[PDB]
Amino acid sequence: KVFGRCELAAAMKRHGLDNYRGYSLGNWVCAAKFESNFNTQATNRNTDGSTDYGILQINSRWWCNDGRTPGSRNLCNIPCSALLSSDITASVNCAKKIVSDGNGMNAWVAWRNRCKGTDVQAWIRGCRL
Asked: Where is the binding site for substrate, in residues?
């Protein structure tokens, strides 16, 4: 399924992402916009054999296990298939572990390239939160 901007903002707030590790809600919505364009089903294959899964494009080399990725660490201890759900719970739970890894939201290149330093609050204006 494809989330609407405001619909996702509400779900992420519900799951405690607003100000999680110091990042306001807008940051998370902005990251989802440029990582997957709010698409919970998106996947992308990489040159290293890994695959990025879901709305937050979580990588199979370090975070989830898809069983076909060389050097997998599965630091979120979850199958990657769980990240392709309409329910964003698994993705948010893993994202919380990723951002606590010392790199902050830099773990998401799209956020780094298009959200960081911008008016991320724009992503939640107009929303009923």
From this structure: 101
CB-based contact 113:121 (threshold 8 Å):
no
**Binding site per annotation, positions:** 101
Sign of the torsion formed by the C-alpha atoms of 113, 14, 91 and 102: positive
Cβ neighbours, 10 Å, residue 34? 17
For residue 123, the number of C-alpha atoms closer than 13 Å in the C-beta half-sphere is: 29
Q: Which helix (H) or strand (E) holds 58?
A: strand 58-59
Is there a catalytic annotation at residue 35?
Answer: yes
Resolution value, angstrom units:
1.9
Q: Domain 1-129: which CATH class?
A: mainly alpha
Active-site residue, 52 included = yes
CA 29 to chain centre: 9
Domain ranges of the chain: 1-129
